[PDB]
């Protein structure tokens, strides 16, 4: 028994809507779990199905099996950033589960007012050292990791203060170079236009 | 329901580790272990049913002894480990539905001579950023450890904080051309401005960082880099 999980990486925005497609080769295979880790945490079971059933729904969540085919699929309606996950699809006739090699889920947040910025920070004590931050910016922005192998630069990430329900993606880059400010840092980055970068 | 432990272990090529898993309710006899290797694949093991089952398994690269003690306790030996891998034990009823356990983490070093804890800093909110967006952003920059065995977290007036954090899912390599580089991970935590504004309100990032025990021989100058928490701070200004 082998099982297989075509999609390796899968980026969508928030709301819209995601699948995972698995297959498996095995046809005595008749319970099909789904689980998810969450970076850098264990696997929690997210929802089954079973050899008589095609199909079945829990929440935003649908799963298919076709026995015939031998392909099972998850179906996520409505995506929130929460998802963000490695998913992972799993077959069972022995009874051990044979697992695919999973599926890295991103879902990033929807910015509803862009505001893309680099600011210096100085360090509570002291000062240089210092970091630059590029923050506010919209999703569909990349930042790419410098060419440079003295200079580093984190990749973006989310932050959500809950209450006043605001999202914010980030990044980081500091050197301890002469020739390294926040004028220069995330150059290698497409970066937009409208970028602030006060003095 | 499971408890595992170690949660976390290091170990130089050579050395073997053993590992426990407690069942914690009597229903879900049908006890399981899964290997999860770097590249995320999970593969499974073993099954024991009964106390008294035993077992031997070949993997690349580790050599894996598991053994049912009890109805309770199930115990596995993994020797000569080459590339590190995370074990989860699982349990079961009538074998179907399986919940996996919190997971045992092992690293694999060559040597002990190039473990690191991390150095800690905090880097205070921008002035423009403040005016800008009414909003303070603190940065702290874990850097100069190795193994990647941190668990970063936020404290503001002597609670922990989740609600304004994000924290790299990954740590990136300071010479990522070497093999055992040292590792670096940066967090941040955002703050009404307001919030920051007063000198009373107090920050603290803190690195749990796993290292060596008391089992662990040392040999050089520099301080034995045990599992220890380092920590930084600021205070809000007007």
């Known amino acids: 028994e082998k099982v297989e999980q075509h999609e390796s990486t899968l980026s969508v925005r928030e709301g819209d809507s995601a699948v995972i497609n698995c297959t498996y080769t095995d046809t005595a295979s008749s319970y099909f779990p789904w689980y998810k880790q969450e970076a850098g945490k264990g696997l929690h079971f997210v929802i089954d199905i079973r050899s008589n059933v095609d199909r079945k729904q829990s929440q935003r969540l649908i799963v298919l099996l076709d026995k015939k085919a031998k392909r099972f699929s998850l179906h996520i309606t409505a995506t929130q950033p929460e998802d963000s996950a490695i998913y992972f699809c799993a077959a069972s006739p022995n009874y051990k589960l044979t697992f695919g090699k999973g599926t890295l889920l991103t879902v990033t947040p929807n910015i509803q007012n862009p505001d893309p910025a680099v600011y210096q920070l100085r360090d509570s004590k002291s000062s240089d050292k210092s970091v630059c931050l590029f923050t506010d910016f919209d999703s569909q922005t990349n930042v790419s990791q410098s060419k440079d192998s003295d200079v580093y630069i984190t990749d973006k990430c989310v932050l959500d203060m809950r209450s006043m329900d605001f999202k914010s993606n980030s990044a980081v880059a500091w050197s301890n170079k002469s020739d390294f400010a926040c004028a220069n840092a995330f150059n290698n980055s497409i970066i937009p236009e409208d970028t602030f970068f006060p003095s | 329901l499971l408890e595992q432990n170690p949660r976390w272990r290091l170990v130089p090529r050579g050395q073997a580790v053993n590992l426990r898993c407690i069942l914690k309710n009597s229903q879900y006899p049908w006890m399981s272990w899964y290997q999860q290797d770097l590249q995320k694949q999970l593969q499974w093991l073993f099954t024991?049913?009964?106390?008294?089952?035993?077992?031997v398994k070949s993997l690349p690269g580790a050599d894996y002894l598991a053994t049912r003690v009890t109805d309770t306790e199930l115990r596995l030996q993994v020797a000569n480990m080459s590339q590190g891998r995370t074990l989860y034990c699982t349990c079961?009823?009538?074998?179907?539905?399986?919940?996996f356990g919190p997971g045992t983490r092992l690293t694999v070093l060559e040597d002990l001579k190039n473990v690191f804890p991390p150095e800690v800093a905090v880097f205070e909110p921008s002035e423009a950023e403040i005016s800008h967006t009414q909003k303070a952003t603190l940065v702290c920059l874990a850097t100069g450890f190795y193994p990647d065995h941190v668990e970063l977290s936020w404290w503001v007036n002597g609670k922990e904080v989740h609600s304004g954090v994000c924290t790299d899912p990954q740590p990136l390599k300071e010479q990522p051309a070497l093999n055992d580089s040292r590792y670096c991970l940066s967090s941040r935590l955002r703050v009404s401005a307001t919030f920051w504004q007063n000198p009373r309100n107090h920050f603290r990032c803190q690195v749990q960082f796993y290292g060596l025990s008391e089992n662990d021989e040392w040999t050089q100058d520099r301080a034995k880099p045990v599992t220890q928490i380092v920590s930084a701070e600021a205070w809000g200004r007007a």
């Open positions: 079961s009823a009538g074998g179907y539905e399986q919940y």
């Open positions: 024991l049913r009964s106390p008294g089952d035993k077992e």
